Amino acid sequence: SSQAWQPGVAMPNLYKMQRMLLEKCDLQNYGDSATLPKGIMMNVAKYTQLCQYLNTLTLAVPYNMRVIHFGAGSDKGVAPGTAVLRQWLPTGTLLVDSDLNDFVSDADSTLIGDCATVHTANKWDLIISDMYDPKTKNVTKENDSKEGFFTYICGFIQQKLALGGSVAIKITEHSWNADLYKLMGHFAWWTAFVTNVNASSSEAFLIGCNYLGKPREQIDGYVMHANYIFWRNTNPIQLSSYSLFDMSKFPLKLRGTAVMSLKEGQINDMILSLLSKGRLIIRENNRVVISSDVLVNN
Amino acid sequence: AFAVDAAKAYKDYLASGGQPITNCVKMLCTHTGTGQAITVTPEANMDQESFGGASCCLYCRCHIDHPNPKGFCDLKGKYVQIPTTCANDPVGFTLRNTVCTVCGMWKGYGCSCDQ
Ligand SMILES: Nc1ncnc2c1ncn2[C@@H]1O[C@H](CSCC[C@H](N)C(=O)O)[C@@H](O)[C@H]1O
Ligand SMILES: [Mg+2]
Ligand SMILES: [Zn+2]
Ligand SMILES: [Zn+2]
């Protein structure tokens, strides 16, 4: 009813509790396009609707914040998603980006190569990714779980994210992984989100909120992807541009959250309580350094 | 004693009748800002549009050296404002005009600094 005036739609709680088997996806409006304002690209409108939805959750925001972004280049040689993120965040925040082919950008610093050659010395407050492999198009057997760059991402999170931060990572019908669903059970809340401007595709973003460092609940990953395909097959959604015309309240808010250093064996029920409600960060506070590996031959 | 000169070369190409450079990056905003030339966040009024800075610089896009003692770039990492009747060639507009150093407006399209 009122759905066409929001920025998008999220997956309801009673669909998460069932036990279904996997089938093929078949959408009623599979090939349609939407009507955009006079001079605007499809990739600028998609990133604006995702930041409007994150304004309704309980994120942490300290003095001197740190952010990193994977898969950032286009087939024409520039970077439209990096320019929307710099408009949203507070003045003085530090930002770094990366990809496999060459391009030019507005960030503070940039690196070129395959994602498995990157290393850093410090820890981070928020993480974003849009990667996708072209030979996934060439379908010739049953639909099973995939590896590749998904194996690098699971290990970076367990080793370099601060207690109290957040993430968002992109998927489709044939591009997915079973150990990433199992790790959503180590945060305080989770979901999956679809934008109103690309509603005729099987794409979505997977989101985790306030990190704790051990399991709260047990989850089987093969069963939970079959529950996601059953919701999309029985509930159709209609294309819309309404929310792009009102920008009087876009920028993110300034809470001044606190930061400490602590050692295992000083974690109380008191302490865990504050992490869950969005009001404490735990890490070191020195200074930032990065690099990339090179092979020599012939 | 020899060196390349690309700034004179785009001018001669345009006068003979070639098509201008495309794919510059445009943003969404309210149109009730202050109107100055180069800023830290978008500031257009009811007679202008706003763009991302690196994609409008001739040296960044051609892959060449910046003409400076310390090769320093004035646009990368900020936002720039352009008048609506000239918005089909943003690269050429910035090469040809100059900024006033006391009020911050473009000379000829905003500076009123004489009674
Ligand atoms: N193994 C890999 N390592 C690094 N980058 C990869 C990769 N597999 C895919 N990519 C990159 O993933 C990108 C998705 S293409 C579209 C990205 C979008 N224009 C954006 O604004 O981010 C491609 O440019 C591709 O180069
Ligand atoms: Mg589409
Ligand atoms: Zn430049
Ligand atoms: Zn003046």
Numbering used by the authors:
A (entry chain A): 1 to 298
B (entry chain B): 18 to 132
Copy out sentences from the published article reporting this entry, exactly as the authors wrote them:
The 2′-O methylation of the first nucleotide converts the status of mRNA cap from Cap-0 to Cap-1, and thus, helps the virus evade immune surveillance in host cells. Here we report two structures of the nsp16/nsp10 heterodimer complex in the presence of a cognate RNA product (Cap-1) that consists of N1 and an adjoining N2 base (me7GpppAmU), and a byproduct of the methylation, S-adenosyl-l-homocysteine (SAH), resolved to 2.3 and 2.5 Å, respectively.
Most strikingly, we observed an overall expansion of the nsp16/nsp10 complex in the product structure as compared to the substrate-bound enzyme (~6.8 Å in one dimension and ~5.4 Å in the other), although the central β-sheet remains largely unperturbed. A positional shift in the Cap-1 analog also occurs, so that the 2′-O-me group on the A1 base now pushes the SAH outward with the sulfur atom pointing away from the 2′-O-me moiety and the carboxy tail of SAH rotates 180° around Cβ of the SAH. The much-relaxed heterodimeric interface in the product structure appears to be a result of overall widening of the enzyme, which is triggered by a single 2′-O methylation event. The product RNA Cap, Cap-1 with adjoining uracil as N2 base at the 3′-end, is accommodated within a deep and elongated pocket constituted by the nsp16 residues on one side of the central β-sheet and the two gate loops (gate loop 1 [amino acids 20–40] and gate loop 2 [amino acids 133–143]). In the Cap-1 structure, the RNA cap-binding groove extends up to ~18.11 Å and the distance between different regions of two loops (Gate loop 1 and 2) that surround the RNA cap also increases up to ~2.8 Å from their respective positions in Cap-0 structure, concomitant to overall widening of the enzyme upon Cap-1 formation. Consequently, almost all nsp16 residues (described above) that interact with product Cap-1 move up to ~1.61 Å away from their respective positions in the Cap-0 structure, thus creating a weaker Cap-1-nsp16 interface. As modeled, Mg2+ is further stabilized by direct interaction with the side chain of an invariant N198 and assumes a near-ideal octahedral geometry with coordinating water molecules. The side chains of K170 and K46 form hydrogen bonds with the 2′-O of the product (i.e., methylated ribosyl of A1 and phosphoryl oxygen of U2 base, respectively).
